[PDB]
Design a protein around this ligand. Structure first.
Ligand SMILES: [Ca+2]
Ligand SMILES: [Ca+2]
Ligand SMILES: [Ca+2]
Ligand SMILES: [Ca+2]
Lengths: 145, 20
């Protein structure tokens, strides 16, 4: 639940890696060279905005503590995701990848509840948002969170 | 486990008994 020691040290080493001059702080130029090596190919305007969000003391640079606070909150997010998705997969009855009207018919049975096909499609359409009559991982995560 | 239990035990019957 809280950062592991192993994660604390990984974040440090990732910090020291991004900090190429050893300044103690990640500047806007180091952030973009790090975001590319992370695959990314970001735009100046985004880098700036990253900087402004992670920075807390107006330096326009990221020190270790600002980086740690950010990484802490990302990993936190990533683990709440992985946990909502353990449940998703309970509701993905046939392990298809998305919760469909078939999955909910079956769930409904397995709870001894007699809900109509119409009663169930409403559900889908509330949580649905790309108009495919399915509930995918992001839709589920969303209607939980 | 706390997530999931709280969905089933409370969240699901509430939602069900609504559509009813
Ligand atoms: Ca630096
Ligand atoms: Ca700063
Ligand atoms: Ca399914
Ligand atoms: Ca969908």
């Amino acid at each position: 639940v809280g950062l592991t020691e192993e994660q604390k040290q990984e974040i440090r080493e990732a910090f020291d890696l991004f900090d190429t001059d050893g300044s103690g702080t990640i500047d806007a130029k180091e952030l973009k060279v790090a975001m590319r090596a992370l695959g990314f190919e970001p735009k100046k305007e985004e880098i700036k905005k990253m900087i402004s969000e992670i920075d807390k003391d107006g330096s326009g640079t990221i020190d270790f503590e600002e980086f740690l606070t950010m990484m802490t909150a990302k990993m936190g997010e990533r683990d709440s995701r992985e946990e909502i998705l353990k449940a998703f997969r309970l509701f993905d009855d046939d392990n298809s990848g998305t919760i469909t009207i078939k999955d909910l018919r079956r769930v409904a049975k397995e709870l001894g509840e007699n809900l109509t096909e119409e009663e169930l499609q409403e559900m889908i359409a509330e949580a649905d948002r790309n108009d495919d009559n399915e509930i995918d991982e992001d839709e589920f995560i969303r209607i939980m969170k | 486990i706390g997530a999931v239990l709280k969905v089933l035990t409370t969240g699901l019957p509430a939602l069900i008994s609504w559509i009813k």
